[PDB]
RNA sequence: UGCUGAAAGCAUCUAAGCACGAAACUUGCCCCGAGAUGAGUUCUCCCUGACCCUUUAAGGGUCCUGAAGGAACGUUGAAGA
RNA sequence: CGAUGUCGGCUCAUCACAUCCUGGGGCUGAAGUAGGUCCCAAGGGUAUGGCUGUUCGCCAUUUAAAGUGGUACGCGAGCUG
RNA sequence: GUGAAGAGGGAAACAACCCAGACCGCCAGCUAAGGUCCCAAAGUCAUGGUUAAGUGGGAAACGAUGUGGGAAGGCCCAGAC
């Protein structure tokens with residue numbers, strides 16, 4: 100998954116989630132859009 | 138005329154029992170340390186142990202606040218090669234729980250020789266009863 | 280010286 | 287399980303039908319007689335305490351003797367404990383023979399290493415030896431640098447240095463058991479165990495696979 | 496809220512047995528089961544259950560909402576019972592079931608033999624299908640999850656342990 | 672990476688709750704180790720005489736006694752400066 | 753500045769992690785073999801030679817790998833000079 | 834302005850910052866800065882709020898349904914999201 104400092108939705112299906120202390124991005128269509136360190 | 142001075146040869150002392158259980162570690166320590174140093178009497182004598190013997194039960198059941206329980210550090214060094222060991226709060230309570238309180242007040246008793254001596258008056262038992270019936274320890278809150 | 284060192 | 291106390295008589299081969307030399311240390315294992323049993327009641331733990339040899343009466347002290355007195359005496363060389371684990375033994379000089387290892391395939395063995403007394407680095411720690419030549423000035427087997435500079439400004443603890451070597455515990459582990467021989471008190475384990483000929487040995491079934 | 500605030504029927508035949516914070520519920524099939532709650536206030540009476548915040552927990556409601564939801568699946572659990580349904584895909588992919596252990600052949604150099612936990616039982620319509628019924632929703636999910644894990648469906652020929660309501664990727668390879 | 676799951680009728684590994692998870696961590700293996708002054712435990716052995724003084728107390732001393740054991744000495748060791 | 757021996761080698765090291773190998777992962781323009789990249793990981797391991805004072809670098813040939821740095825560019829009351 | 838040529842209290846330790854200008858004695862009292870749970874003198878003080886991060890007790894562009902407050906607006910039982 101991509102790590103980055105700025106994370107943001109990519110597809111219309113990307114979703115954004117705050118798990119543990121960390122901000123994330125989950126895409127149900129496109130694995131490339133997973134993101135952490137947000 | 139010089140103001141009074143406690144004298145080791147004739148200090149009172151007396152014993153007590155305290156229940157760690159729900160009590161929050163440290164807010165507990167405070168009073169232990171205070172009572173351990175004698176700061177609730179004619180303490181009036183920095184250079185003399187005037188505190189009370191006081192024993193603590195259920196140290197394992199001691200309480201903490203915050204995410205402290207899994208995040209408090211507790212470090213020490215073996216004096217060796219590169220031997221910086223550590224152990225988390227829960228880890229401490231797991232193996233020799235009595236430690237948590239012990240070090241927690243040890244840090245709040247003074248400095249050096251006397252200080253070390255004050256610490257000897259505190260008996261910290263993991264469990265519930267204690268083999269000190271003979272001292273006839275009187276319970277106290279806080 | 281020388282001076283030996285050288286320099 | 288438990289193990290026993292023996293004496294290194296030591297080292298000889300035994301040849302096999304299909305022509306192979308099996309080097310074996312020969313451990314003499316006279317019967318071990320339990321001098322004491324220990325229990326969670328008389329605090330602590332579950333262990334047995336054996337003795338094995340034989341000792342001169344005039345050498346056995348009052349206490350040692352009185353201790354042997356409880357249970358079948360005949361004071362032996364010394365005493366040794368083995369921790370227990372759901373096996374049980376009554377003290378009346380139960381006597382445990384080499385019988386114990388008939389079915390054992392493993393065995394660990396512990397001696398007291400031969401005494402080298404000194405060594406210094408090179409022998410003690412396999413330190414490299416400086417140029418024997420090439421201008422070296424009085425620094426051929428010396429240890430060379432032993433620290434950094436100002437910033438540690440000290441030598442760290444456990445630095446490898448010259449000093450006492452050997453004449454200490456050391457055990458070996460694994461060691462196939464080649465032969466078990468009661469009414470001969472022999473035990474041939476395959477090859478090489480620590481300590482010198484004659485010295486005392488403790489063998490236990492191996493803790494590792 | 497909403498889910499918390501909605502009620503929940505207790506269909507005829509079910510037990511329910513609150514005791515402080517410990518609900519327990521028996522029905523037709525199913526080993527009853529028993530949850531714990533915390534900043535929730537569970538309220539019986541009626542042919543229903545109702546959940547609401549307890550004074551002084553800012554976490555309330557969100558807690559009640561879960562609580563309601565959990566209890567619910569217990570009712571539905573111990574009554575109708577819960578689903579499952581996995582299917583193998585890939586040459587040489589067998590499944591057996593001896594008693595309460597699935598015997599899978601998933602192209603490894605050894606068997607696997609996954610032992611079912613407690614309140615869950617398994618069947619094999621074909622060598623390439625596994626349906627496992629059970630009451631405890633949390634666990635039934637887990638076991639299928641475990642079963643899928645032995646060979647998560649790879650995206651080139653879909654081979655491996657599937658759900659059935661799954662979606663499964665599939666990408667065009669691209670030699671080379 | 673998951674299961675279950677609300678806050679947010681949905682979705683969601685998480686906020687409650689549960690499962691996986693690495694040569695790192697705590698152990699398991701080997702060695703040291705009660706100066707661990709927080710100086711621990713267990714077994715065994717040994718000593719069962721008289722008498723005086725003062726400011727009379729963990730007081731000082733006289734005669735008898737000299738244990739278990741230890742040490743010294745000697746012959747010494749695959750132990751050792 | 754009434755003196756803080758300065759390059760490389762040798763011997764001995766010791767920490768950091770921005771990880772060379774080994775371990776665990778996500779993504780892959782991941783079929784497989786095998787790569788790429790990011791995340792986690794510092795437990796252990798981490799080349800002999802030719803040339804040159806070299807460090808380095810080039811070259812030969814290995815290896816799972818031949819890691820980057822701090823330590824008075826570690827290491828003259830240890831050696832080499 | 835201070836140190837230099839100024840001690841004292843505060844700033845953990847810290848000429849140069851903060852408070853303050855030591856003629857001598859005092860086991861009196863009131864304050865300044867700075868503080869008042871323990872080391873450690875003095876509030877585990879009162880009332881009303883905020884933060885859940887050990888934030889408080891190191892750092893930016895930038896990222897984000899963390900969370901408190903305010904003004905205004907859109908759609909809604911002719912059924913809104």
Ligand SMILES: CC[C@H]1OC(=O)[C@H](C)[C@@H](O[C@H]2C[C@@](C)(OC)[C@@H](O)[C@H](C)O2)[C@H](C)[C@@H](O[C@@H]2O[C@H](C)C[C@H](N(C)C)[C@H]2O)[C@](C)(O)C[C@@H](C)C(=O)[C@H](C)[C@@H](O)[C@]1(C)O
Pocket residue numbers: 280281282283284755757
């Ligand atoms: C045999 C007997 C002599 O020793 C040698 O000659 C060694 C071999 C010299 O090194 C020789 C060899 C060598 C390499 O120094 C190591 C060379 O550089 C110098 C100049 O002379 C020394 C040490 C020199 O010191 C060095 O002098 C440098 C100026 C500075 C250095 N310091 C910063 C640490 C300092 O130690 C120096 C001056 O002779 C020391 C002074 C006090 C003396 O005159 C004393 C009496 C010496 O003659 C002597 C001890 O009797």
